[PDB]
Amino acid sequence: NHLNFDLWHTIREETAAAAAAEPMLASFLHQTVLRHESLGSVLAYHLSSKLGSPIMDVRALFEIYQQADTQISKCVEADLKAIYERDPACDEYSLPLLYFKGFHAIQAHRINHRLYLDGRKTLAYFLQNRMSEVFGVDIHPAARLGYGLMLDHATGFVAGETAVLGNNISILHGVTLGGSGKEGGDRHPKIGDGVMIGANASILGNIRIGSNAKIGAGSVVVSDVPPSITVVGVPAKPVARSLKTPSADMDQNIQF
Amino acid sequence: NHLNTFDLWHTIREETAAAAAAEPMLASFLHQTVLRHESLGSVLAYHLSSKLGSPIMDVRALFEIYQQALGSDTQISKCVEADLKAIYERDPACDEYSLPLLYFKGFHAIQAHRINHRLYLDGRKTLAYFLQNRMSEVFGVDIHPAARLGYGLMLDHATGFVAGETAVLGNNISILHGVTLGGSGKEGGDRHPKIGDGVMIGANASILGNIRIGSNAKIGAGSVVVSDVPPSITVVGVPAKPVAPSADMDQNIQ
Amino acid sequence: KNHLNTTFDLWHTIREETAAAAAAEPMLASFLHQTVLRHESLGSVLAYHLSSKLGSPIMDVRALFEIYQQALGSDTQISKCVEADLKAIYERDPACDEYSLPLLYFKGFHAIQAHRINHRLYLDGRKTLAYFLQNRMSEVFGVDIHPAARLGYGLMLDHATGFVAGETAVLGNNISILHGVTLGGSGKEGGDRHPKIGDGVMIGANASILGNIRIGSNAKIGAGSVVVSDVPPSITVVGVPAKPVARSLKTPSADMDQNIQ
Amino acid sequence: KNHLNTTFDLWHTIREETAAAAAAEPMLASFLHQTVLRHESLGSVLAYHLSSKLGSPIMDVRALFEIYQQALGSDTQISKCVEADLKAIYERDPACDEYSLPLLYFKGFHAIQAHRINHRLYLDGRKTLAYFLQNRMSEVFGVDIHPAARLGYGLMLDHATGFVAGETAVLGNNISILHGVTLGGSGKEGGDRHPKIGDGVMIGANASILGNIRIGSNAKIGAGSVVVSDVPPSITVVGVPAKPVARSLKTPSADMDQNIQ
Amino acid sequence: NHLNTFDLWHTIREETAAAAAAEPMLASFLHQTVLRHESLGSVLAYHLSSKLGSPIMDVRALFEIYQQALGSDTQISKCVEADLKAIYERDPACDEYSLPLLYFKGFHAIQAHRINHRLYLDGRKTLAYFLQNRMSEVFGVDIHPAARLGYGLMLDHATGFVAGETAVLGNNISILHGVTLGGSGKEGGDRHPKIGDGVMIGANASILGNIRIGSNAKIGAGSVVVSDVPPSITVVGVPAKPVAPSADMDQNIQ
Amino acid sequence: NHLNFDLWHTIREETAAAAAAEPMLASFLHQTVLRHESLGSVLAYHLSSKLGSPIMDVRALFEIYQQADTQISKCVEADLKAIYERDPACDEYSLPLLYFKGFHAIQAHRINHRLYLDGRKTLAYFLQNRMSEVFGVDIHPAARLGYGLMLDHATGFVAGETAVLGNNISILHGVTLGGSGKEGGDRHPKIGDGVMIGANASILGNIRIGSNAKIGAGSVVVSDVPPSITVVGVPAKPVARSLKTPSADMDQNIQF
Ligand code: NA
Ligand code: NA
Ligand code: NA
Ligand code: NA
Ligand code: NA
Ligand code: NA
């Protein structure tokens, strides 16, 4: 794997094996993965498969997705490696690529965010709605998402217009990065690097979640959370430090 | 807008013609869903049937059923208009009336339910149960056809909303995704919440049993409410306790 | 007439309910005839309806139907679980007064039975197919159950939306679960890491049960609880985090109900 | 009972035939209820069924249905032609013993009525739409009729496959046409260049009638003929090229049929 | 092949596995249509239902109807096998048994008709009329369900073929596209041709009325036949005249 | 027009006008024509729209059609100009491109012929069948078709495995270029340049049709036809010269 490497080449090897083992899916795997020359082309194809509709032709969606910021494709690879690292249900890179709804919703949003920043708001709203119907995930096209993100299970995830997510964040299903008040402007959470958010937690308002903080499942967070702090409860309260500094751990290993 | 000026239908058409001009690949969708029609109700029946049509019941048949149900009770479309105005007022992500009309899952689920409720009360329970399941699959929203919903309702995001058979909702209520207006016990009879006017319910809160929520109460996100809530009280926690609204949408629970 | 007051054919009662619905609703008559009345068994009906739900251009409904039919034929315990589930929903859900209502229209019943077949496909080594269907189930039903999760009989998953059960989750028999419930994992390592739920448990809406913990038989998890430690039998737990707050059962010695009829 | 022996409601007879078919064939009951029985008029049924045939992802069936309904409402002569056609098929086709059979299942009847609406759309200036539908008709029905072609009432196009009628073709009333017939043009120039067919004509299978020629009333074109010159009334023509070979009608003075009952 | 060796079903599977290996985007189609099945009849029911399925009657329902009809008369599949062998023998464009099975419109129309005929004789006339129209739309072939077809029949290209209510076809007949076995008159009763064994009919020929075509006659392309044709006679022209066969497929008319 | 020129540019102008006049079709015209950069890309898109099916994804067909011999695209343009010239029902180039089934069947065959020559016979047979179902046209993938062809109406056209067509030929619906005998090898007609074939004519066997010959509608041709000859009847017989030499016509015009 990538921790001991060509991601695209490994996905091709996993997929050709799956196609050989499952004749039911051979032509799906060949048309979605093997006939393509790059991971980005595969992703555009598979995402258009998911979100295409009578209104929005899969071919038209596929072309738009292919035409979409080479930074997006760098985030995609980081996201895939993050899932491999952090999700014990994932032992193959092609498993989230083809079958993890939260991975799909994140990458669909990245493209949606580009279309929205390009001024194609009606199209982005149409696709925001389609993502919510098909993936059970509602991300406002203006939300800004860093790389190395994992959205495990995904169902019920909500992130609003002014939400900002840093890098290497892990999020469970049912999580809300929600707004407060009836006025526009900054009103959704900003999440620092390294944060973990447990299932069905809510983070509400224009509050900051510090780097490497941990939000326990079921928490309702309505105030800032300092870096390296764990919060729990309804409403959420600091209960522990989420990570130990080297000076606290005193780990003397120097091998690796 | 409706707070400044106002013709809701004409504003929607003007917004839609603008969208079609800007996004030519959506132009025919917008012309067929909105601009070719002559009333808001016909647009709603068309768009809802596009969402919920399936092999079992195709978009054409559902369109005719929806037009017939709307025609049988002209007040449904009145609640539709009130809901659209409520979303415009209360949701800062909404600056155009046609945005919830066309793209907000919670708006579609609520109006789909109003038609289901009409069909159910007409005695068409099997059809209403089919459509309840269809709404749950497509929108992620489970509303029993017997539930009674007022006007000026906003269901933001919508995913995971549940309201059961004996639930009753007043007017000008605001609800977030994940909210449960759920039952208790294995017996029939009144067993679901009754929600007063002006109430706001935060994300993933649950309200369970035959209990009353007083007018203008606020249910904090993540709250679990199992007993009556007096008017103008704010409750937070699991179980929820009084500690301190559909118009203001303030989500603070501290 | 029902399974609680008649010495009772589930399949024939479902056929009779369906013939009645078809005569009352011409809009749905041919669906009911193709999905229910033209079939010879409840298992064939279920395989047909489920493949209708999860089929796609990728996965032909006819092929899925045959796969589901063969899987039901390969593991006849599944159909017995199916029957127990329908009776459980009839017994416990006051919105259910007919057996064909959950069979045709309750998404939580569909997701459970789709998983039972999915689990069989997984055990037979069709893991790619099982992962494809896990994803399809999550999309169509809003329910994410790992194919390796183990589910007993007499289960009710009411409303269903948002239910999650992970790779090493185990559910016993006669369990009742509301929408939004999580039987979730902890940590980045493989091995046993999801809850094991004993017989008779009730789990309320949007509760989360996390880690390799045991929920004892007849326990009750209140709506919205977050459970991160073992829960002993016959205990009710509430809160975030969840704490024991009461005994879950009323003993006959406490009730003093003297009826013998 | 029918239109030849009852002083007769076409629409209500069609409803009665359809209710009978729906009760006998549960596979088709909901189609018959959605296509026929839930409607209030034959024109609404026709618009619904035709849009089912010619609709596509490009052209939403619901939009086409409304366009066809408005076109039928804009030109109430079309529905009168529709009724004449159904009676003509009942009278002349021995395979037809029920009025709803061509209405629902005869491709030549569908193509003719689709053209009548197509012609109206063309005259109103919706030429792009009419060309789109001309192509759709050719694909789905195997029938190519230019939107500018003019068709009278009481027409039967039996089997239909391969029928072609070009831009300046004109068909009178009470004409019978078999599959494979061509009312075709000649030359690379615009202007009148297709046949004009008089009342009462019969045209046999795979005949071709080419150029700006006139086929006189009550003429008969035998199957397989190629007609490139005018044909006078009451004449039968046969061959490649076609030549007059007989008189097409038996006069009462020749038959000497003395019945007065 | 069946003239050299022979197992038709096994040869079809071997051909199909070869095709799937060569054309990976068709592999799942071939596995789902052919290789997953255990008999030729089940493949035919599956593939015909893929062709004729529609919103009114979906591929699944038609598949079950077709399997039931085939199961009710095991001789249909016998005629299917004879037809496939006839096409292999007589059509130089056919060097594999699975090519007509999967890709020849005329083969599909004929087998679709055999099922229609069974349904029609069972009394399911409405369903048979629906499928007759469906066959006409999809295949360009109009065969009345009451028509009687023998075995070893080949309909090459098929487009425009018409056979009416009282038509009767013998065995080992070869027919090209555009051929009419048509009626005459406005009255019921026998009014369509009866075709003897071994007859060959060229492209776009018509045979009209209650007339008999003798065994091994040859009908030239473009012929119009309105009276009986004796056995082993070749006729050409409009109207057709004797001037001088399903195995040899010689199209000369001079 | 091209007789008094950019074909692709004229089609774009015709199509933008049609889109402006017909809101029902605006997004179809935009997705099929206007969003593309070349006529070949439009043709690949529209053909895949016609022949796509559940088995054969429109995206997969579109990619294959786009990947398909830059001579094919030259024939396409010649075919479009031929229809404009010869068909009085055609006064716009985009009319046959989008709505003439015979134009579609010919171009679909050209691509099919390339796939077949590349050895993808199963795919070509699949598409031959699909063309026959959707267009009512049966052309064997091995048939070789020249440029400047017009197939007017198209329904019932049949051309077999060894048929060869030259350039600037005009063919009506119902025409058969058919084989004879049960053996392989050359057994279908070879059609010379400039030929016209009328409706429902049949040309059978390994016979040669000479350049600028004319086959009357309803003819059955079973022997060679010399250049510049018109044949009529069942069976067909020479009846006239089809074109006049300059020496026969004595036209003295020298203007144009
Ligand atoms: Na992992
Ligand atoms: Na607003
Ligand atoms: Na119950
Ligand atoms: Na009749
Ligand atoms: Na052969
Ligand atoms: Na022209």
Author numbering:
A (entry chain E), F (entry chain E): 4 to 7, 11 to 74, 78 to 265
B (entry chain C), E (entry chain C): 4 to 8, 11 to 249, 255 to 264
C (entry chain A), D (entry chain A): 3 to 9, 11 to 264
The study reports:
SAT synthesizes O-acetylserine from substrates l-serine and acetyl coenzyme A and is a key enzyme for regulating cellular cysteine levels by feedback inhibition of l-cysteine, and its involvement in the cysteine synthase complex. Using X-ray crystallography, we have solved the structures of NgSAT with the non-natural ligand, l-malate (present in the crystallization screen) to 2.01 Å and with the natural substrate l-serine (2.80 Å) bound. Both structures are hexamers, with each monomer displaying the characteristic left-handed parallel β-helix domain of the acyltransferase superfamily of enzymes. The six active site residues in N. gonorrhoeae comprise of Asp96, Asp161 and His162 from the left monomer and Asp147, Glu170, Arg196 and His197 from the right monomer, with His162 and Asp147 forming the catalytic dyad.
The crystal structure of NgSAT was solved by molecular replacement to 2.01 Å with l-malate (from the crystallization condition) bound in the active site. The asymmetric unit contained six monomers arranged as one complete trimer and another trimer split into 1/3 and 2/3. A complete hexameric molecule is apparent after repetition by a crystallographic two-fold axis. The C-terminal tail adopts two conformations, with the tails of two monomers in the trimer extending away from the trimer and the remaining monomer exhibiting a folded tail conformation. Data show the presence of l-malate (present in the crystallization condition) forming meaningful active site interactions in the structure. The most notable difference in active site coordination is where the l-serine γ hydroxyl forms meaningful hydrogen bonds to flanking His162 and His197, whereas in the NgSAT malate bound structure the equivalent carboxylic acid group maintains a hydrogen bond with His197 but is orientated away from the catalytic His162, and is co-ordinated by the backbone amide of Gly188. In the extended tail conformation with an ‘open’ active site there are seven water molecules interacting with l-malate, whereas in the tucked tail conformation with a ‘closed’ active site there are an additional two water molecules coordinating with l-malate. The ‘closed’ active site recruits additional residues Gly188 and Gln261 to join Arg95 and Gly190 in solvent interactions and residues Ser189, Lys223, Asp260 and Gln261 become involved in tail interactions. Glutamine 261 is noted to be of particular importance in this ‘closed’ active site conformation as this has key interactions securing the tail position and involvement in the active site chemistry, drawing in additional water molecules. Competitive inhibition is supported by the observation that in cysteine-bound SAT structures from other bacteria, the flexible C-terminal tail of SAT is folded against the active site, as also seen in the ‘closed’ active sites in our NgSAT structure.
